[PDB]
Every structure is written in C-alpha cells, then in structure tokens.
Nucleic acid binder design. Structure first.
Ligand code: SF4
Ligand SMILES: [Mg+2]
Ligand SMILES: [Mg+2]
Ligand SMILES: [Mg+2]
Ligand SMILES: [Mg+2]
Ligand SMILES: [Mg+2]
Ligand SMILES: [Mg+2]
Ligand SMILES: [Mg+2]
Ligand SMILES: [Mg+2]
Ligand SMILES: [Mg+2]
Ligand SMILES: [Mg+2]
Ligand SMILES: [Mg+2]
Ligand SMILES: [Mg+2]
Ligand SMILES: [Mg+2]
Ligand SMILES: [Mg+2]
Ligand SMILES: [Mg+2]
Ligand SMILES: [Mg+2]
Ligand SMILES: [Mg+2]
Ligand SMILES: [Mg+2]
Ligand SMILES: [Mg+2]
Ligand SMILES: [Mg+2]
Ligand SMILES: [Mg+2]
Ligand SMILES: [Mg+2]
Ligand SMILES: [Mg+2]
Ligand SMILES: [Mg+2]
Ligand SMILES: [Mg+2]
Ligand SMILES: [Mg+2]
Ligand SMILES: [Mg+2]
Ligand SMILES: [Mg+2]
Ligand SMILES: [Mg+2]
Ligand SMILES: [Mg+2]
Ligand SMILES: [Mg+2]
Ligand SMILES: [Mg+2]
Ligand SMILES: [Mg+2]
Ligand SMILES: [Mg+2]
Ligand SMILES: [Mg+2]
Ligand SMILES: [Mg+2]
Ligand SMILES: [Mg+2]
Ligand SMILES: [Mg+2]
Ligand SMILES: [Mg+2]
Ligand SMILES: [Mg+2]
Ligand SMILES: [Mg+2]
Ligand SMILES: [Mg+2]
Ligand SMILES: [Mg+2]
Ligand SMILES: [Mg+2]
Ligand SMILES: [Mg+2]
Ligand SMILES: [Mg+2]
Ligand SMILES: [Mg+2]
Ligand SMILES: [Mg+2]
Ligand SMILES: [Mg+2]
Ligand SMILES: [Mg+2]
Ligand SMILES: [Mg+2]
Ligand SMILES: [Mg+2]
Ligand SMILES: [Mg+2]
Ligand SMILES: [Mg+2]
Ligand SMILES: [Mg+2]
Ligand SMILES: [Mg+2]
Ligand SMILES: [Mg+2]
Ligand SMILES: [Mg+2]
Ligand SMILES: [Mg+2]
Ligand SMILES: [Mg+2]
Ligand SMILES: [Mg+2]
Ligand SMILES: [Mg+2]
Ligand SMILES: [Mg+2]
Ligand SMILES: [Mg+2]
Ligand SMILES: [Mg+2]
Ligand SMILES: [Mg+2]
Ligand SMILES: [Mg+2]
Ligand SMILES: [Mg+2]
Ligand SMILES: [Mg+2]
Ligand SMILES: [Mg+2]
Ligand SMILES: [Mg+2]
Ligand SMILES: [Mg+2]
Ligand SMILES: [Mg+2]
Ligand SMILES: [Mg+2]
Ligand SMILES: [Mg+2]
Ligand SMILES: [Mg+2]
Ligand SMILES: [Mg+2]
Ligand SMILES: [Mg+2]
Ligand SMILES: [Mg+2]
Ligand SMILES: [Mg+2]
Ligand SMILES: [Mg+2]
Ligand SMILES: [Mg+2]
Ligand SMILES: [Mg+2]
Ligand SMILES: [Mg+2]
Ligand SMILES: [Mg+2]
Lengths: 231, 137, 148, 208
RNA sequence: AGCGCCGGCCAACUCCGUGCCAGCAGCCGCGGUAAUACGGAGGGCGCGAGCGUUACCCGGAUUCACUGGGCGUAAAGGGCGUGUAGGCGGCCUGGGGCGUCCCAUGUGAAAGACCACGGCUCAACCGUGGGGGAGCGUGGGAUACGCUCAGGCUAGACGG
RNA sequence: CUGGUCCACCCGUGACGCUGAGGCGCGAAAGCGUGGGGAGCAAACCGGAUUAGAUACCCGGGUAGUCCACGCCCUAAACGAUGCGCGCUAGGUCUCUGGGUCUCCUGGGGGCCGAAGCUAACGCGUUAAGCGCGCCGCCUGGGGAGUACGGCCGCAAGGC
C-alpha cells in the first residue's frame, strides 16, 4: 500500500532545533534544515503498518492524537473514515490514566443527547435550556471523537510526540503501544512504531494517516478510493 | 593518564549508560587479554584493532538487553557493574583460596596471574592466584 | 487476593489560619508468600481510608521475586537517596534476620531464609522503597545466561 | 526450679489449650472451654494489636511453657541447636523432645509432664537398666526407658498404663505394654508433632 | 520464694491518695484536683535461689568508615603560587625474578577453641581421637600485573 | 623594561610526566616604622538636630588615614563558601579571541538552558557537584573557643 514518492510529499523539515536521538534517521541538513532519510522512513512504514495490519484483522481499537493546526481537521477526516476514536482539540489530562472519570463525563454528553432529542420538559427554565444547550456545544468540541472510545485502546496513533508527550506518557504508563508520525524534534526511543516524517506539511499528514486508514479498512473488509483532503 | 586499565573500564561503563553501539579505548597487549575475557564471558559483542588518526585503539562493540515495556523503554544492561579492585594506590593480591565469588556466581572477577588473565572460576581450575583486576556483572 | 500488612501509619499536619489540619499516611506491603510482593503508600484525610488506598496502590505496583527454597538468588545492595539496604543469601536453617520494614516485605514475599542489614538513613518510607528496587533487580542463572 | 504454679492461667494467656493437666484437660471443666480469655482484671477488655515483639514473645513462651522448662535451659538448648548442623528449628524441637521427662510423658507413662517429672525425680523411672532421677537426661536413639520394678507395682503407674493399651505413639517411638518399658527409636521430624507453635518465630525472637 | 518491671522504646492496667507538692528519671519526658509516668493496693508481665543496681569492656556506632563515610549551602578544600622529600605514572620488546602466585617441607608446645566418641546416673567438669589455618625458615616452580635493568616508539610533557 | 597565554605549521626532544608533608615567595583593606605629600574625602573628636536618652542614623565642621618612597604586618564573606592534573559521558543559544574554504567548520576562554547521571533538597550538569584514576589539604555534635597553656613569628596591634 506504500510508495516511493513520499519525497514528492514531504522528505521532512525543521532546522538545528532537533533531538540528537533522531540522528540515526536524518540524512543531511540541506538548507540548514534536517532532511529525513526516506529509505529509512519506509523501513519503519513497513514495520509500523505490519503492527497496524495485525490489529485491523483482529479488530482492535486505535486512538488518533493530533492537535496542532496542521493536523487539526485532517484527523476527524481519517478517523471517522476508519470509524475509530480521535482527538482534534485539547487533549484532556488523564483521558487514559483517569479513563473511568474522564469517560464518566461522556455519560453526561449521552445524557444531554437524551434530553435535547425532544421534547421532555421544554417547560424547564429558559436559563436552564440556554445553559445545557451551551454545555452541549462545549462537550461536543472536545469529546466528539472520544465517545467512540468505550474501552482502553490496544494502541494510540500520534501526530507530534513532542507536542503530545502527555498522551505518549499515559500510554507508556498503561503499556499501551504508541504508533506515531515524528520529525527531527521528537524522541525516537519514546515511540514504539515510528513514522519518521514531516509533521507540519498537510501533505505528509494526509499520506501517512490516509494510507494508514486505507490499511485499516482494507483488512477489515473491502477497499475504497482516496479520501477528502484540502490541498 | 595514570591508570590505563581503569580508564578502559570507565570508558566502557560510561558508554553503556547511553547505549552506544561501540566505543574506543587506547590499545594495549594487556587491555586486549582482558577484553578477550570480557567477550568470551559474554559481556561484549567483541572487539577489533582499529586506528584513530594513525594511533592504535581498541573498538569495543557493546551488548544490551531487549526493548522494554513501560514509561522507560530503555533496555537492561549486560554489564550492570564494572569497577577496579586492585589500584595504583593499593595493589590487591589474593591467593587462590581467597578468591571471591562475584555475585554468588552470576558474575566474574577478572584476574592477572602468572599463568595469564583468568577468571575466578579458571583460577581455581588452573590452581593459581594473583592481582585482582576487577569485578564485573 | 493476597495477604496484607500495615508497615507504617503516621500523622502529618499542614497549616492554615486558626490552626493545623491533619492527614494520615499508610505504608502497606502485600504478598502471597510465593514470590509476588507489592508496596504502596496511601495518603488520605483519615486512617482507614488511607490504609484502603495504600492497598489499592500496593496491588497497582507489583514485583515478581525469584525465590529459591525461600532465599534470594544473589546478594543485592541498593541505595534510595539516603537509605541503603543490604540483602544476603542464607541457608534453610537461618530464618529471616531483618529490620521490621524489610522484614514485613520479605515475609509476604515468601522469603524465609535471608540475612539483611539497613545502612545510612533508616527512614522507613525510604527504606521500604529501597528494598523493592533491590528485589526488582534480582536475577537468575537463566536471566544472566539469557542476557548474554 | 520449674514453673510450679497455677497452670490454667498459662493457656488462657496463650489463647490455646496446653494439655498440662492430663485428665482435667479433656473434661469440659477445662479453663479454656469455660473462659477462652486472658487471666486477670482486664481479660475481657478488647485486645489491641500485639506488637511484632509481642507475637514472638508469646510463641517462645508458648513452646517453653509447654515443656514446663526454665528459660535458661530453654536458651541453652536453642543455642546448642543454633550451633548444630541443619535446620535450627528441627534440631531445637528434637532436643526439647529428647528430654527424659518428656519421653516419659510421651510414651504415656504419665498424664502430664509435670507429673512425668516427679516420676523421673522420685526414681520411679529407669533407662537401659540404671536408675535415673534427672528430668534433663538427654535421650538418645536406642535408650530403653523402663519403670523400676520396685515402682512397677504402684497404683498411679497402673491407672496410666491401663490407658496405654491401644493409644498410638509417634513414628519415632515404640512401646511394650504390661512390661512397662519402651524405646526411643529416632529424633522426631517436625512433621511428627503438630504443636501450636510456628517455630520459625522462636528463632526470630532470639535474633534481637 | 524471691526480685524486678507494667507511659513510648518495651511484655504487662485498673482504683484510692497527693495536687509543679511529695516524688520518678536511661533517653523522650511525668506531677500545677481524672496521673496506665509519683506513693499504696488489686490485678498483670518477666525471670526464678535468685532477681535488680552501680562500675568497666565490646556491641549496636557505616559515629575514625581496610571491609565500610565524608568536605557548594549540614562539621569539613589550605588566600594563591613555586617547589623539597614522598606517593603515583603512557605504548612496544627483551633480561633479571624483588614484590606477587603455586607446590613440596620444617616450625606453628600443652591446655583452650571446633568436630566425633567416651567417664562421672545428666550437665557443668573431665578423658581419647580428628581437622586445620595464618605467620616465618627452606628447596623447587611460574612471569600476567607492580618492580628493576636494557633497547626502541611518539599519543603525555616540553621545545622550534 | 617584563610575565603568563592562545592559534596555525605538525619541524625538533623521547615519558623528560602529575601531585606535593616541610621550605620559599606573593598576598585586598585597615594597621605600624622613617621621611615626603596633603585638593577632596574621612575613624577619633566638636557642634546642630532628631529623641524619653541618641556616646547613632541626618546636617555644619574635623585630626589620623586615604596618596609617594623604602621597610614591616600576613588577616578576610582572601567565595565559585566548589584543591590540582587527567580520561570518558546529548545537545541548544548568547559572547570574547584565534585558524580554515569564513554558508560554516575547528581550537582556547566567558555566561545561560539543558541528555544521561548525581544530590537530603535546593540545584550541578564537557567551566560537573556525572562516571573514574592519582596526590595533597581538611571534617568527626552545640557552646566553652579560635579562648588557655606551651612554642614560633611581630616594633606593636597581633598572627600561626
Ligand atoms: S485444663 Fe489442661 S488444657 Fe484446659 S486449660 Fe487447664 S491446662 Fe490448659
Ligand atoms: Mg514538528
Ligand atoms: Mg577493597
Ligand atoms: Mg525475575
Ligand atoms: Mg534515604
Ligand atoms: Mg549517597
Ligand atoms: Mg545461594
Ligand atoms: Mg544518620
Ligand atoms: Mg531515628
Ligand atoms: Mg539454677
Ligand atoms: Mg500437649
Ligand atoms: Mg543451624
Ligand atoms: Mg500423633
Ligand atoms: Mg545476637
Ligand atoms: Mg526487668
Ligand atoms: Mg499518659
Ligand atoms: Mg505494652
Ligand atoms: Mg469512682
Ligand atoms: Mg501532701
Ligand atoms: Mg519505680
Ligand atoms: Mg488533670
Ligand atoms: Mg488522681
Ligand atoms: Mg503506678
Ligand atoms: Mg516508670
Ligand atoms: Mg548478679
Ligand atoms: Mg559502647
Ligand atoms: Mg567500628
Ligand atoms: Mg574508606
Ligand atoms: Mg558521615
Ligand atoms: Mg574531592
Ligand atoms: Mg580556593
Ligand atoms: Mg596562611
Ligand atoms: Mg620527585
Ligand atoms: Mg616508582
Ligand atoms: Mg608502568
Ligand atoms: Mg619488563
Ligand atoms: Mg620473586
Ligand atoms: Mg594447639
Ligand atoms: Mg557420657
Ligand atoms: Mg582434646
Ligand atoms: Mg578455623
Ligand atoms: Mg603450613
Ligand atoms: Mg619479565
Ligand atoms: Mg626505556
Ligand atoms: Mg604530544
Ligand atoms: Mg608545541
Ligand atoms: Mg614530528
Ligand atoms: Mg628519535
Ligand atoms: Mg606543582
Ligand atoms: Mg607548602
Ligand atoms: Mg597586605
Ligand atoms: Mg594599605
Ligand atoms: Mg602608622
Ligand atoms: Mg604611614
Ligand atoms: Mg611614633
Ligand atoms: Mg606622616
Ligand atoms: Mg588636609
Ligand atoms: Mg553630636
Ligand atoms: Mg541633644
Ligand atoms: Mg543622659
Ligand atoms: Mg558628617
Ligand atoms: Mg566636610
Ligand atoms: Mg591619632
Ligand atoms: Mg601617627
Ligand atoms: Mg594609632
Ligand atoms: Mg576578594
Ligand atoms: Mg564574587
Ligand atoms: Mg575562578
Ligand atoms: Mg575558608
Ligand atoms: Mg560551613
Ligand atoms: Mg592543594
Ligand atoms: Mg577567523
Ligand atoms: Mg566554550
Ligand atoms: Mg544550569
Ligand atoms: Mg533527568
Ligand atoms: Mg557520589
Ligand atoms: Mg522538592
Ligand atoms: Mg555546551
Ligand atoms: Mg575553563
Ligand atoms: Mg555533594
Ligand atoms: Mg562536648
Ligand atoms: Mg564541642
Ligand atoms: Mg590566638
Ligand atoms: Mg584571628
Ligand atoms: Mg601564649
Ligand atoms: Mg587560617
């Protein structure tokens, strides 16, 4: 499902603002910008997906983590397309480690889904209506991709391990594997199944997530044609 | 430099804490004999006579444990512990009958003897004592 | 389920206007006397709540210790900041010769024959943690041969 | 010498029946079977958690109060077992058992060790022929423990032998009834007796 | 049959009396009218022809740290250089064999100790036997490391 | 007139090295001796205020001294409260000064943030308080006390 034209979509970026552990994956520093070996990238792409592919044909959950602007919407695209939980906005502290209490809040979301599904007592105070309707807007913003999650994932997928070090930590504490796209600023050893590539160009975010989500449904029954993506 | 031997052991110990694939020590026909024992007893993947800027060195290829689970994915060491026993400040000599069992058997005491560099096991085998070089486990 | 033993129960206080306000802490070790032990330190506004909580952490933090006829495989020494614990292999007839804190751990660990000694600071909390990290570092003839 | 006092207060403190009387022990007029709580003004008050030390004091006092023996001789044996090869617990228990007054009570010659002592003490017992009046004699394998014939024709021995027809006596002991004479076969394995004592804790008492 | 103890360490709890008094006390600390902490009593704990105290030794004290500690702010880097003695010292190859290691051998009295058995009715005590070691004298052996002498090298050091 | 030091070249010497009990020198300020000098400043001292008092803080004065020469003293928060040398253990950034090809690379210094690791914590972190070897100095509860006695140094103050 892979390719050889990933250099036609990213080949990596970012200057001498690196993590010295990532050295084994970098080829050269070009325009004062570290350039990732793409040959090295594929090697892991093989290894990484091999793990993903085993999880897909076993039918186990995946958690998609990405909150930078570059990977803001492009997760909601690919995650729903895989039908698996994601996080688009603020990654709440303790979603995994304190799952029981975090998930205790989704039952309020499902509770608001209940009441505002019409009608049950619209004779409730005008201020009361306003609050809850406002409260629904709030919960939806953060918990939209997290309600799909009803148990602790068999793995989590991350856009920026540096940016989402909090998540990685929780998974580390819970023996939950970490698959991730990661450029030169990230800690390679902290990631289990690593995708050493650009995490800012919306190109590479697409290729890596899509071809992952393509691999997701492919071993789950059927194949499909390319997904929606703004150039 | 005042203790060539210790420097080596320290070069190794330091290099293993950051999991270097290899590391270089200034060469010596005695450092080699020690390194030989270190490789055979399975502490290191091995060594080879290299050159650095025309100068003789010994490159030592380091051996570690498997990738680990949890918050610290750092593998275990193969050399958890290595340190000088005898020193320039104080030469430590033991007869055969007083050769210590390193870690109840799980480790070795490298020793320099009048019949070559031997381990504690081998010393009792060959039946000789000598200067206690170091202990490793 | 496992067997539980309280090691330490202490009161601590903090300050606010109008007086000092308290909290209780509970060192709790837990084990099956078959080579599996756990240590937890539980803190809560009351005594029994804290002990309960300790037991919860105690199971949340385990370590599989390799007994061999009721004794550890090799000698082990670990320092935890200021506190130091010494563990030494002992014959069948020996019994456990240990301070109360590492004794509580090694009895629930099923260790029946071991020589020990505390050194440095004997802070129970720190001594406790120190002993676990020592057990956590015990290796077998296999484990040693396996690595190499 | 030995404890020589009120003996039911012992059991009530130990929380266990120590069969120190013989007959009365089995009757429902036993101290434990009527009051299973400690002797004295505060025996019914709810006990507080016994200290680590408290636990080991009791178990040693228990094992010692069983044999009606002085703390010195107790200590000295333990020490002798502490020096001697093997599992210290076994050797200690065996050595405590190899005492003449105990062997006499074990082979059923008496109802209580307390009574078993006076039998030894008053010359009523013999070993391999010769008379022995020493409650401390170290019984070895091969020792023929007999009643002196000049003491054979006595009520108290008869009544107590009249109970020893079919009562089985440990794997390390033999017995010839009627003839009033038995033999010490071997040193009791820990298995051979199921004394209410975790003897590991006794070692730990003395390691302070 | 006695003696000590029963606040925590540390095993053993209640009543009366006193009221910062009388007194206890190894340390923390007790007593100013609700004292398991003083004195008495009952009861309890521990030992037992002994129990307690004082004195001293070692231990706990890894608190003179060889085993086995420390010196930024806890006690602790000399105000700084220069250098005597001393201590320590790079890579290679030889000779010696002092240190070092091995074997043989002599000495290492007896008693004590350790292990086994045996004599006193047991034990204490005592007898017979057994295992030894350090350490030094001696002869033989080894040479990796330390040493020494000899000959080389240039990574330290110094000079152009 | 003169010391230290860094770089480049990689030409010379062949371990000639490191540390250093004593010893020797140097050692801010104040202080002492002899002789100069003396504008400003300013211990002591005088006065004016403040104040309960004000032998102070503030103000008006003001002598030693501060300055020079030569000779003494040898103390300190003489501090990085961190002895010297050496090897090894991610980097990021600011700066000074050299050499290359000058994008930048490579040395030697001066800071900051930080991998690993250390640490009781604070914090240290290639300028280690990391991991190691060598040598010296020093610590061993608070006060008594840097006191006493003795000794050595000093003109004294006083120092060790
Ligand atoms: S009767 Fe025998 S058993 Fe029951 S208490 Fe008195 S002594 Fe113990
Ligand atoms: Mg990035
Ligand atoms: Mg040593
Ligand atoms: Mg294990
Ligand atoms: Mg500690
Ligand atoms: Mg420490
Ligand atoms: Mg063993
Ligand atoms: Mg201490
Ligand atoms: Mg203490
Ligand atoms: Mg007596
Ligand atoms: Mg009985
Ligand atoms: Mg024994
Ligand atoms: Mg039976
Ligand atoms: Mg003892
Ligand atoms: Mg007493
Ligand atoms: Mg009280
Ligand atoms: Mg008590
Ligand atoms: Mg009343
Ligand atoms: Mg009065
Ligand atoms: Mg008294
Ligand atoms: Mg009162
Ligand atoms: Mg009263
Ligand atoms: Mg009283
Ligand atoms: Mg008292
Ligand atoms: Mg006496
Ligand atoms: Mg003492
Ligand atoms: Mg000592
Ligand atoms: Mg030392
Ligand atoms: Mg200390
Ligand atoms: Mg130092
Ligand atoms: Mg200094
Ligand atoms: Mg001086
Ligand atoms: Mg010299
Ligand atoms: Mg020399
Ligand atoms: Mg040399
Ligand atoms: Mg030579
Ligand atoms: Mg020689
Ligand atoms: Mg002798
Ligand atoms: Mg005999
Ligand atoms: Mg003899
Ligand atoms: Mg001996
Ligand atoms: Mg000899
Ligand atoms: Mg030679
Ligand atoms: Mg030469
Ligand atoms: Mg050079
Ligand atoms: Mg030069
Ligand atoms: Mg040259
Ligand atoms: Mg030449
Ligand atoms: Mg010097
Ligand atoms: Mg000097
Ligand atoms: Mg001066
Ligand atoms: Mg001056
Ligand atoms: Mg003057
Ligand atoms: Mg003058
Ligand atoms: Mg004058
Ligand atoms: Mg003048
Ligand atoms: Mg003037
Ligand atoms: Mg005035
Ligand atoms: Mg006035
Ligand atoms: Mg006045
Ligand atoms: Mg003025
Ligand atoms: Mg003026
Ligand atoms: Mg004057
Ligand atoms: Mg003058
Ligand atoms: Mg003057
Ligand atoms: Mg200064
Ligand atoms: Mg300064
Ligand atoms: Mg400086
Ligand atoms: Mg100082
Ligand atoms: Mg200080
Ligand atoms: Mg110095
Ligand atoms: Mg330049
Ligand atoms: Mg620099
Ligand atoms: Mg810093
Ligand atoms: Mg860290
Ligand atoms: Mg340290
Ligand atoms: Mg803190
Ligand atoms: Mg740096
Ligand atoms: Mg510097
Ligand atoms: Mg420190
Ligand atoms: Mg004093
Ligand atoms: Mg003092
Ligand atoms: Mg003085
Ligand atoms: Mg002074
Ligand atoms: Mg004087
Ligand atoms: Mg001084």
């Amino acid at each position: 499902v892979k390719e050889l034209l990933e250099a036609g979509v990213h080949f990596g970026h970012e200057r001498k603002r690196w993590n010295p552990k990532f050295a084994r994956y970098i080829y050269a520093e070009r325009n004062g910008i570290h350039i990732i070996d793409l040959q090295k990238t594929m090697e892991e792409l093989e290894r990484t997906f091999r793990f993903i592919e085993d999880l897909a044909m076993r039918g186990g959950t995946i958690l998609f983590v990405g909150t930078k602007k570059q990977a803001q919407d492009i997760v909601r695209m690919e995650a729903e397309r895989a039908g698996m939980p994601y996080v688009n906005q603020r990654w709440l502290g303790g979603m995994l480690t304190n799952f029981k209490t975090i998930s205790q809040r989704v039952h309020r979301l499902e509770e608001l889904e209940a009441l505002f599904a019409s009608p049950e007592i619209e004779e409730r105070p005008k201020k009361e209506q306003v609050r809850l309707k406002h409260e629904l807007e709030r919960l939806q913003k953060y918990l939209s991709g997290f309600r799909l999650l009803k148990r602790l994932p068999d793995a989590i997928f991350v856009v920026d391990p540096t940016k989402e070090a909090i998540a990685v930590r929780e998974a580390r504490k819970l023996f939950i594997p970490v698959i991730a796209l990661a450029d030169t600023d990230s800690d390679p050893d902290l990631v289990d199944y690593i995708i050493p590539g650009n995490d800012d160009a919306i190109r590479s975010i697409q290729l890596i997530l899509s071809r992952a989500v393509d691999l997701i449904i492919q071993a789950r029954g059927g194949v499909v044609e390319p997904s929606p993506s703004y150039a | 430099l005042t203790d060539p031997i210790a420097d080596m052991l320290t070069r190794i110990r330091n290099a293993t804490r950051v999991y270097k694939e290899s590391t270089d020590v200034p060469a010596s026909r005695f450092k080699e004999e020690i390194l030989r024992i270190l490789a055979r007893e399975g502490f290191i993947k091995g060594y080879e006579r290299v050159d650095v800027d025309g100068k003789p060195y010994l490159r030592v290829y380091l051996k570690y444990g498997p990738r680990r689970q949890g918050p610290d994915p750092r593998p275990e060491q193969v050399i958890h512990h290595i340190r000088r026993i005898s020193k320039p400040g104080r030469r430590v000599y033991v007869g055969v009958k007083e050769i210590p069992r390193v870690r109840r058997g799980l480790g070795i005491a490298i020793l320099s003897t009048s019949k070559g560099v031997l381990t504690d096991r081998e010393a009792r085998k060959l039946g000789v004592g000598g200067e206690l070089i170091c202990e490793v486990w | 389920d496992f067997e539980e033993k309280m090691i330490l129960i202490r009161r601590t206080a903090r300050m606010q206007a109008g007086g000092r306000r308290f909290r209780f802490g509970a060192l709790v070790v837990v084990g099956d006397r078959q080579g599996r032990v756990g240590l937890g330190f539980g803190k809560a506004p009351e005594v029994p709540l804290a002990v309960q909580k300790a037991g919860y952490y105690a199971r949340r933090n385990m370590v599989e210790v390799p007994l061999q006829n009721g004794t550890i495989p090799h000698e082990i020494e670990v320092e935890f900041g200021a506190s130091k614990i010494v563990l030494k292999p002992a014959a069948p007839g020996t019994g456990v010769i240990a301070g109360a804190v590492p004794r509580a751990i090694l009895e629930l660990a099923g260790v029946t024959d071991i020589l020990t000694k505390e050194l440095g600071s004997r802070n129970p909390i720190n001594i406790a943690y120190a002993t676990m990290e020592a057990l956590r570092q015990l290796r077998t003839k296999a484990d040693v041969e396996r690595l190499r | 010498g030995r404890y020589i006092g009120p003996v039911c207060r012992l059991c009530r403190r130990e929380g266990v029946k120590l069969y120190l009387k013989g007959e009365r022990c089995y009757s429902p007029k036993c101290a434990m079977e009527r009051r299973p709580y400690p002797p004295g003004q505060h025996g019914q008050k709810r006990a507080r958690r016994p200290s680590d030390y408290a636990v080991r004091l009791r178990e040693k006092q228990k094992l010692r109060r069983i044999y009606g023996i002085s703390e010195r001789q107790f200590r000295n044996l333990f020490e002798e077992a502490s020096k001697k090869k093997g599992v210290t617990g076994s050797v200690f228990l065996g050595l405590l058992e190899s005492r003449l007054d105990n062997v006499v009570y074990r082979l059923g010659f008496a109802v209580s060790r307390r009574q078993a002592r006076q039998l030894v003490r008053h010359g009523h017992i013999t070993v391999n022929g010769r008379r022995v009046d020493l409650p401390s004699y170290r019984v070895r394998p091969g020792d023929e423990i007999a009643v002196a014939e000049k003491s054979r024709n006595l009520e108290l021995i008869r009544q107590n032998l009249e109970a020893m027809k079919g009562r089985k006596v440990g794997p390390w002991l033999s017995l010839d009834v009627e003839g009033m004479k038995g033999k010490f076969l071997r040193l009791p394995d820990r298995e051979d007796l199921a004394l209410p004592v975790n003897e590991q804790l006794v070692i730990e008492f003395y390691s302070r």
